[PDB]
């Protein structure tokens, strides 16, 4: 368990950084006081069903991001939260093949 | 001394096995290439000669003042999943790349 060799330690940094990874960060989403079923008691409201299918809903159907680019659940978001060349890589939600 | 004699007996056994194998192979290949026209006298002519001569020779070799075979033991040394082009050539195509399955199997 001694490890601590400069080489052994250097491998640890690369492996850990790879798994993890001007703002280009997602738009802040605030409080959600009316939830569609329990919070607003608006179960089966037809506008909500229409909005989810085609309209852009910030958190039900996608992630807004900054710079305006809209990323849907199936798509993968590439963003750069740190001020460095390396960019965080959001992957897909539906991941539907 | 007895090791030299043991090796000589081993080589003789190898020769016998090789001959028997060759005979069997030729026989089945000939059966498949002839199929028809083959008749009972010829089929009996081939089965009997090959099997009898080779088997009698093997038993005779095993029992003529040769080293005691129950003494020696075979225990695998190195196994490497590496591709080998020499064991494939040496064993004439079967048993390539001495893997883990092959030692319990053989």
């Amino acid at each position: 368990l001694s490890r601590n060799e400069i080489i052994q330690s250097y491998l640890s940094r690369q492996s850990s950084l790879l798994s993890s990874s001007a703002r280009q960060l997602h738009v802040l989403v605030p409080q959600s006081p009316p939830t569609d079923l329990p919070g607003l008691t608006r179960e089966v409201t037809q506008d909500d069903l229409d909005r989810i299918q085609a309209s852009q809903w910030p958190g039900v159907n996608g992630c807004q991001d900054t710079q305006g680019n809209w990323y849907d659940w199936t798509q993968c978001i590439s963003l750069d939260p740190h001020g460095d060349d390396g960019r965080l890589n959001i992957l897909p939600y539906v991941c539907l093949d | 001394r007895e090791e030299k004699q043991l090796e000589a007996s081993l080589d003789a056994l190898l020769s016998q096995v090789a001959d028997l194998k060759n005979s069997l192979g030729s026989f089945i290949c000939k059966l498949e290439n002839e199929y028809g026209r083959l008749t009972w006298p010829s089929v009996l002519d081939s089965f009997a000669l090959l099997s009898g001569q080779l088997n009698t020779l093997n038993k005779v070799l095993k029992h003529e003042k040769t080293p005691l075979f129950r003494n020696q033991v075979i225990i695998p040394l190195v196994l490497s999943p590496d591709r080998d082009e020499d064991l494939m050539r040496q064993t004439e195509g079967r048993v390539p790349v001495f893997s883990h399955e092959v030692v319990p199997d053989h």
Partner: protein
């Protein structure tokens, strides 16, 4: 009782998904008996959803279908057969998962 029958049959069908056990049964000569093919034909009741609801290891069902072709049981007595089938199974499994993950990650990193 019928409960013990159900439990033993479930365990046996889930165990059939093992190529090692299949090669075991094929070498021991259980497949050559005309009783085992009728038992397999009876075992097809697991295809129903109410019965498939209790199957923890689902990989068996498809395999079971192959056992009905009457050429799968004549072969598979070889150990190379179990070798190859388990190889392809684990390869499909692990490669599908990790390859989807790695492809997504590598494409996201390269496009940036």
């Amino acid at each position: 009782g019928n409960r013990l029958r159900f439990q033993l049959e479930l365990e046996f069908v889930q165990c059939l998904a093992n190529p090692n056990y299949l090669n075991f049964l094929a070498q021991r000569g259980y497949f050559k008996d005309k009783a085992f093919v009728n038992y397999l034909k009876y075992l097809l009741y697991w295809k129903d959803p109410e019965y498939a609801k209790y199957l923890k290891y689902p990989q068996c069902l498809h395999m079971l279908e192959l056992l009905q072709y009457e050429h799968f049981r004549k072969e598979l007595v070889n150990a190379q057969c179990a070798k190859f089938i388990d190889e392809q199974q684990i390869l499909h499994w692990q490669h599908y998962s990790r390859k989807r993950m790695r492809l997504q990650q590598a494409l996201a990193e390269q496009q940036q």
